[PDB]
Coordinates of all heavy atoms in Angstrom, one line a residue:
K111 N 122.8 36.0 -153.5 CA 121.5 35.6 -154.0 C 120.6 36.8 -153.9 O 120.6 37.5 -152.9 CB 121.1 34.5 -153.1 CG 121.9 33.0 -153.4
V112 N 119.7 36.9 -154.9 CA 118.7 37.9 -154.8 C 117.3 37.3 -155.2 O 117.2 36.4 -155.9 CB 119.0 39.0 -155.8 CG1 120.3 39.8 -155.5 CG2 119.0 38.5 -157.3
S113 N 116.3 38.0 -154.5 CA 114.9 37.5 -154.8 C 114.6 37.9 -156.3 O 115.1 38.8 -156.9 CB 113.9 38.3 -153.8 OG 112.6 37.8 -154.1
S114 N 113.7 37.1 -156.9 CA 113.4 37.3 -158.3 C 112.8 38.6 -158.5 O 112.8 39.2 -159.6 CB 112.5 36.2 -158.9 OG 111.5 35.9 -157.8
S115 N 112.3 39.2 -157.4 CA 111.6 40.5 -157.5 C 112.6 41.6 -157.8 O 112.4 42.6 -158.4 CB 111.0 40.8 -156.1 OG 109.8 41.7 -156.2
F116 N 113.9 41.5 -157.4 CA 114.9 42.3 -157.8 C 115.5 41.9 -159.2 O 115.6 42.8 -160.1 CB 116.1 42.3 -156.9 CG 115.7 42.8 -155.5 CD1 115.3 41.9 -154.4 CD2 115.7 44.2 -155.2 CE1 115.0 42.5 -153.2 CE2 115.3 44.7 -153.9 CZ 115.0 43.8 -153.0
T117 N 115.7 40.7 -159.4 CA 116.1 40.2 -160.8 C 115.2 40.8 -161.9 O 115.7 41.2 -162.9 CB 116.1 38.6 -161.0 OG1 117.0 38.0 -159.9 CG2 116.5 38.1 -162.3
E118 N 113.9 40.9 -161.5 CA 112.9 41.3 -162.5 C 113.0 42.9 -162.8 O 112.7 43.2 -163.9 CB 111.4 41.1 -162.0 CG 111.1 39.6 -162.1 CD 109.7 39.4 -161.7 OE1 109.2 40.2 -160.9 OE2 109.0 38.4 -162.1
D119 N 113.6 43.7 -161.9 CA 113.7 45.1 -162.1 C 115.1 45.5 -162.4 O 116.0 45.9 -161.5 CB 113.2 45.8 -160.8 CG 113.4 47.3 -160.9 OD1 113.3 47.7 -162.2 OD2 113.6 48.1 -159.9
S120 N 115.3 45.6 -163.7 CA 116.7 45.8 -164.2 C 117.2 47.2 -163.9 O 118.4 47.5 -163.8 CB 116.7 45.8 -165.8 OG 115.9 46.8 -166.3
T121 N 116.3 48.2 -163.4 CA 116.8 49.6 -163.3 C 117.5 49.8 -161.8 O 118.0 50.8 -161.6 CB 115.6 50.6 -163.5 OG1 114.8 50.6 -162.3 CG2 114.8 50.3 -164.6
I122 N 117.2 48.8 -160.8 CA 117.7 49.0 -159.5 C 119.0 48.1 -159.3 O 118.8 47.0 -159.2 CB 116.6 48.8 -158.4 CG1 115.5 49.9 -158.6 CG2 117.1 48.8 -157.0 CD1 114.2 49.6 -157.7
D123 N 120.1 48.6 -159.1 CA 121.4 48.0 -158.8 C 121.6 47.7 -157.3 O 122.6 46.9 -157.1 CB 122.5 48.8 -159.3 CG 122.4 49.2 -160.8 OD1 121.9 48.3 -161.6 OD2 122.9 50.2 -161.3
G124 N 120.8 48.1 -156.4 CA 120.9 47.9 -155.2 C 120.2 48.9 -154.2 O 119.3 49.7 -154.7
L125 N 120.4 48.7 -152.9 CA 119.7 49.6 -152.0 C 120.7 50.4 -151.1 O 121.8 49.8 -150.9 CB 118.8 48.7 -151.0 CG 117.4 48.6 -151.3 CD1 117.2 47.9 -152.6 CD2 116.5 48.1 -150.3
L126 N 120.4 51.5 -150.8 CA 121.3 52.3 -149.7 C 120.3 52.6 -148.7 O 119.5 53.6 -148.7 CB 121.9 53.5 -150.5 CG 123.0 54.2 -149.6 CD1 124.1 54.8 -150.5 CD2 122.3 55.3 -148.8
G127 N 120.5 52.0 -147.5 CA 119.5 52.1 -146.3 C 120.0 53.4 -145.6 O 121.2 53.7 -145.3
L128 N 118.8 54.0 -145.2 CA 119.0 55.3 -144.5 C 118.1 55.3 -143.1 O 117.9 56.4 -142.5 CB 118.6 56.5 -145.4 CG 119.5 56.7 -146.6 CD1 119.0 57.8 -147.5 CD2 120.9 57.3 -146.0
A129 N 117.6 54.2 -142.7 CA 117.0 54.0 -141.5 C 118.2 54.0 -140.3 O 119.3 54.3 -140.7 CB 116.1 52.8 -141.4
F130 N 117.8 53.6 -139.1 CA 118.8 53.6 -138.1 C 119.7 52.3 -138.1 O 119.1 51.2 -138.6 CB 118.2 53.8 -136.7 CG 117.7 55.3 -136.7 CD1 116.4 55.5 -137.1 CD2 118.4 56.3 -136.2 CE1 115.9 56.8 -137.0 CE2 117.9 57.6 -136.1 CZ 116.6 57.9 -136.5
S131 N 121.0 52.3 -137.8 CA 121.8 51.3 -138.0 C 121.5 50.0 -137.2 O 121.9 48.9 -137.4 CB 123.3 51.8 -137.7 OG 123.7 52.8 -138.6
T132 N 120.7 50.2 -136.1 CA 120.1 49.1 -135.4 C 119.4 48.1 -136.1 O 119.3 46.9 -135.7 CB 119.3 49.6 -134.2 OG1 118.3 50.4 -134.7 CG2 120.1 50.5 -133.2
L133 N 118.9 48.4 -137.4 CA 118.3 47.4 -138.2 C 119.2 46.8 -139.2 O 118.7 46.0 -140.0 CB 117.1 48.2 -139.1 CG 115.9 48.7 -138.4 CD1 115.0 49.4 -139.3 CD2 115.3 47.7 -137.5
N134 N 120.5 47.2 -139.2 CA 121.3 46.5 -140.2 C 121.6 45.1 -139.9 O 121.6 44.6 -138.8 CB 122.7 47.3 -140.0 CG 123.8 46.7 -140.9 OD1 124.5 45.7 -140.6 ND2 123.7 47.1 -142.2
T135 N 121.6 44.3 -141.0 CA 121.4 42.8 -140.9 C 122.9 42.1 -140.8 O 122.9 40.8 -140.7 CB 120.7 42.2 -142.1 OG1 121.3 42.2 -143.2 CG2 119.3 42.9 -142.2
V136 N 123.9 42.9 -140.9 CA 125.2 42.2 -140.9 C 125.5 41.4 -139.6 O 125.3 42.0 -138.5 CB 126.4 43.1 -141.2 CG1 127.7 42.4 -141.2 CG2 126.1 43.8 -142.6
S137 N 126.0 40.2 -139.7 CA 126.4 39.4 -138.6 C 127.9 38.8 -138.8 O 128.2 38.5 -139.9 CB 125.4 38.2 -138.5 OG 125.8 37.3 -137.5
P138 N 128.6 38.6 -137.8 CA 128.2 38.8 -136.4 C 128.5 40.2 -135.9 O 128.2 40.6 -134.7 CB 129.2 37.8 -135.7 CG 130.4 37.9 -136.6 CD 130.0 38.1 -137.9
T139 N 129.0 41.1 -136.8 CA 129.4 42.6 -136.4 C 128.5 43.4 -137.2 O 128.7 43.7 -138.4 CB 130.8 42.8 -136.7 OG1 131.8 41.8 -136.1 CG2 131.2 44.2 -136.1
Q140 N 127.5 44.1 -136.6 CA 126.6 44.9 -137.2 C 127.3 46.1 -137.7 O 128.2 46.7 -137.0 CB 125.5 45.3 -136.2 CG 124.3 45.9 -136.8 CD 123.2 46.1 -135.7 OE1 123.4 46.7 -134.7 NE2 122.0 45.8 -136.1
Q141 N 126.8 46.7 -138.9 CA 127.5 47.7 -139.6 C 126.7 49.0 -139.6 O 125.5 48.9 -139.4 CB 127.8 47.2 -141.1 CG 128.8 46.0 -141.0 CD 130.1 46.4 -140.6 OE1 130.7 47.4 -140.9 NE2 130.6 45.5 -139.6
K142 N 127.3 50.1 -139.9 CA 126.6 51.4 -139.9 C 126.1 51.8 -141.3 O 126.8 51.4 -142.3 CB 127.6 52.5 -139.4 CG 128.0 52.3 -137.9 CD 129.1 53.5 -137.5
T143 N 125.1 52.6 -141.3 CA 124.7 53.1 -142.6 C 125.6 54.1 -143.2 O 126.4 54.7 -142.5 CB 123.3 53.7 -142.5 OG1 123.5 54.9 -141.8 CG2 122.4 52.9 -141.8
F144 N 125.4 54.5 -144.4 CA 126.1 55.5 -145.1 C 126.1 56.8 -144.4 O 127.1 57.5 -144.1 CB 125.8 55.6 -146.5 CG 126.5 56.8 -147.3 CD1 127.7 56.7 -147.8 CD2 125.7 58.0 -147.5 CE1 128.3 57.6 -148.5 CE2 126.3 59.0 -148.0 CZ 127.6 59.0 -148.6
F145 N 124.9 57.1 -144.0 CA 124.7 58.4 -143.3 C 125.3 58.4 -141.9 O 125.8 59.4 -141.5 CB 123.1 58.5 -143.1 CG 122.8 59.8 -142.4 CD1 123.2 61.0 -142.8 CD2 121.8 59.8 -141.3 CE1 122.7 62.2 -142.0 CE2 121.4 60.9 -140.7 CZ 122.0 62.0 -141.0
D146 N 125.2 57.3 -141.3 CA 125.8 57.3 -139.9 C 127.3 57.4 -140.1 O 127.9 58.1 -139.2 CB 125.6 55.9 -139.2 CG 124.3 55.9 -138.3 OD1 123.7 57.0 -138.2 OD2 124.1 54.9 -137.6
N147 N 127.9 56.8 -141.1 CA 129.4 56.9 -141.2 C 129.7 58.4 -141.7 O 130.7 58.9 -141.2 CB 129.8 55.9 -142.3 CG 130.0 54.5 -141.8 OD1 130.4 54.4 -140.6 ND2 129.7 53.6 -142.5
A148 N 128.9 58.9 -142.5 CA 129.1 60.3 -142.9 C 128.9 61.5 -141.9 O 129.6 62.5 -142.0 CB 128.2 60.7 -144.0
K149 N 128.2 61.1 -140.8 CA 127.7 62.2 -139.9 C 128.9 63.0 -139.3 O 128.9 64.3 -139.1 CB 127.0 61.6 -138.7 CG 125.5 61.5 -139.0 CD 124.9 60.9 -137.8
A150 N 130.1 62.3 -139.0 CA 131.2 62.9 -138.5 C 131.7 64.1 -139.2 O 132.1 65.1 -138.7 CB 132.3 61.8 -138.2
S151 N 131.7 63.9 -140.5 CA 132.2 64.9 -141.4 C 131.2 65.8 -142.0 O 131.6 66.9 -142.5 CB 133.0 64.2 -142.5 OG 132.2 63.7 -143.5
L152 N 129.9 65.6 -141.9 CA 128.8 66.5 -142.4 C 128.8 67.8 -141.6 O 129.0 67.8 -140.5 CB 127.5 65.8 -142.3 CG 127.3 64.6 -143.3 CD1 125.9 64.0 -143.0 CD2 127.3 65.0 -144.8
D153 N 128.6 68.9 -142.4 CA 128.5 70.2 -141.8 C 127.3 70.2 -140.8 O 127.5 70.9 -139.7 CB 128.1 71.3 -142.9 CG 129.3 71.5 -143.8 OD1 130.4 71.0 -143.6 OD2 129.0 72.2 -144.8
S154 N 126.2 69.5 -141.0 CA 125.1 69.3 -140.2 C 124.7 67.8 -140.3 O 124.6 67.3 -141.4 CB 124.1 70.4 -140.4 OG 122.9 70.1 -139.7
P155 N 124.4 67.2 -139.1 CA 124.0 65.7 -139.3 C 122.6 65.6 -139.7 O 121.7 65.0 -139.0 CB 124.2 65.3 -137.8 CG 123.7 66.4 -137.0 CD 124.2 67.6 -137.7

């Protein structure tokens, strides 16, 4: 389900969150952001 506010904006296919993973909404097992997952392999975090 999506809010009509997203339905209305055809140009945005979704969100990629880059705040800290403590705000992630997955339940019951909270998930890491793309950046958090990438950090291990990034030249610099």
